[PDB]
Structure 1
Amino acid sequence: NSNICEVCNKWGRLFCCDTCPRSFHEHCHIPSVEANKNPWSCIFCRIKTIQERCPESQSGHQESEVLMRQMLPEEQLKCEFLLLKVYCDSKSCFFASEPYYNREGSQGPQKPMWLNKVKTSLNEQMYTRVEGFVQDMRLIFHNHKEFYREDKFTRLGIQVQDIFEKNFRNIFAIQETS
């Protein structure tokens, strides 16, 4: 197994996957690494299994159909993974915790949103459809773009949103287009 957390790339108290070489801090993994279970498989392995059980799940889909899906266990897992993939980029640090807005010439967003809040919302089963999760995630980046206006700091919102969107297209097997 790896000697660093797959998500934050740091050593510490790691839990090891029994079916792949990845390792995780307890709260870097999503969901949090489970108390018992021997063996244990990480979310990368769990997602791989879904694909292997149903190869046709990788055929292209329409985003509009994916968003209307009910958060049944497999979609719950897929959203958890997608959130994890965003946390894997170090630039997610800017969007993790609850922001505040006090900048000359800007107003704060009507509906603040951050990654830890989405994490909690997933954990407490507050989303009934994929749409709820995806809207909140896009809101994070949209609020940022809007607030930072012409400051070059806006680019961080663009960069992290590109990570989100690519992983969203991959995990939910959205039909490739130009």
Structure 2
Amino acid sequence: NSNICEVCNKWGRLFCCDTCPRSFHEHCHIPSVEANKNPWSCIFCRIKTIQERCPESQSGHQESEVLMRQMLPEEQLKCEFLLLKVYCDSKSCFFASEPYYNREGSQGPQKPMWLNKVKTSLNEQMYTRVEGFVQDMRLIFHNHKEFYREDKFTRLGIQVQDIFEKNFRNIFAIQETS
């Protein structure tokens, strides 16, 4: 198994996947690594199993259909993975914790949002449809773009949004387009 956490790339108290060589800190894995279960399979392995069980699940989909899906266990898992994929990028640190807004010439957003809040919401089963999760994720980056205006710091929002959107298209098998 790897000797660093797959998400944060640090050593420490790691839990090892039994079906692949990845390792995780307890709260880096999403959901948080489970108390018992021997063997244990990580979220990457659980997602791979869904695909393998239903190969046709990788045929192209319309985003509009994906967003209206109810958050049954498999969609719940997919959103947890997609959230985890954003945490995997080091630039997610900027969007992880609760932000504050005091910049000359800008006003803060009406509805602040951040990754740890989305993480809690997923954990507490507060989203009934994929759309709920996706809207909060996109709001993160949209609030950032709006607040930072022409400061070059706006690019961090573009960059992390691009990681989100690419992973969304991959995980939910969105029909490729030009």
| Same-fold status (TM-score > 0.5) | yes
Match of 1:21 in 2: 21
* Aligned equivalents of 1:160, 1:95: Cα separation in 2: 9
Q: TM-score, normalised by structure 2?
A: 1.00
- What does the per-residue CA deviation read over 1:46-105, in whole Å, with 9 as the maximum and x for residues that have no partner? 000000000000000000000000000000000000000000000000000000000000
Alignment length (residue pairs): 178
Runs of 4+ deviating beyond 4 Å:
none
SS at match of 2:15: strand
- What does the per-residue CA deviation read over 1:15-74, in whole Å, with 9 as the maximum and x for residues that have no partner? 000000000000000000000000000000000000000000000000000000000000
* Aligned equivalents of 2:172, 2:88: Cα separation in 1: 18
SS at match of 1:40: coil
Structure 2: runs of 5+ lacking an equivalent: none
Deviation at 1:174, TM superposition (A): 0.0
- What does the per-residue CA deviation read over 1:109-158, in whole Å, with 9 as the maximum and x for residues that have no partner? 00000000000000000000000000000000000000000000000000
Identity %: 100
Root-mean-square deviation (CA, aligned residues, Å) is 0.1
Match of 1:87 in 2: 87
* Aligned equivalents of 2:16, 2:23: Cα separation in 1: 5
Q: TM-score, normalised by structure 1?
A: 1.00
Structure 1: runs of 5+ lacking an equivalent: none
